[PDB]
């Protein structure tokens, strides 16, 4: 399997943009245990900016950019023993873009039995007249 991400994503300052991330192709028997979004160049307490659990849903441990400006676009947690969670589309959305949001974002899938599969995307924040 592989992580499909764009090498670069461009968004307007103060606007909203999406960071695509997919675990392709669908493989029967491959279980996604966790999705982790990281800013690997931000300090240790600020790296883990978003995570998604198949049962408990999303979390945003780092205050920067924090939950106020981050959201999962299509990740759906499980709804009991009937419906299985859908974490293959780990696309992350940033709202109210600031110049502090420019840089590298990593999208990692903690998969069983394959392991950790990760891709990286650089977010470019476009400043008006700049």
């Amino acid at each position: 399997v592989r992580v499909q991400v764009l090498p670069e994503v461009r968004g307007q300052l103060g606007g909203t943009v999406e960071l695509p991330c997919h675990l392709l192709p669908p493989v029967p028997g491959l279980y996604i245990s966790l999705v982790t979004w990281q800013r690997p160049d931000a300090p240790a307490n600020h790296q883990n900016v978003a995570a998604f659990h198949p049962k408990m849903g999303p979390s945003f441990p780092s205050p920067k950019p924090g939950s106020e400006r981050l959201s999962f676009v299509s990740a759906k947690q499980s709804t009991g023993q009937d419906t299985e969670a859908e974490l293959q589309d780990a696309t992350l959305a940033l709202h109210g873009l600031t110049v502090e949001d420019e840089g590298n974002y990593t999208c990692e899938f903690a998969t069983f039995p394959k392991g950790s599969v990760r891709g990286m995307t650089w977010l470019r924040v476009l400043v008006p007249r700049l």
Partner: protein, 108 residues
């Protein structure tokens, strides 16, 4: 801040058994543990073991034994490895995220 410790030792007088140990000191339960020899998991290292708290344990060569240990930690035994080899452990935990550290045999 969450911390991952890694310890690799030769714990037998026969001097023919690498023992890899690593644990996660955090605020949440572990969703997955990935162990790799040579480098970071999924980023250059060769996958050695994948551990899930419910779906079981997955291991590759040359892992003779991979198992869970107490207090959010695991242990690993190699068959027979070099003294300068690095072993990396990555813990994926909700809600704090993923954390990884690496270790090696201490000098004699």
């Amino acid at each position: 801040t969450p911390e991952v410790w890694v310890q690799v030792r030769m714990e037998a007088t026969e001097l023919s058994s690498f023992t890899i140990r690593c644990g996660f000191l955090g605020s949440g339960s572990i969703s997955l543990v990935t162990v790799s020899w040579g480098g970071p998991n999924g980023a250059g290292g060769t996958t050695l073991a994948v551990l899930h708290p419910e779906r079981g344990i997955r291991q590759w060569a040359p892992a003779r034994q991979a198992r869970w240990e107490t207090q959010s930690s695991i242990s690993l035994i190699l068959e027979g490895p070099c003294a300068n080899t690095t072993f990396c452990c990555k813990f994926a935990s909700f809600p704090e995220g993923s954390w990884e550290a690496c270790g090696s045999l201490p000098p004699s």
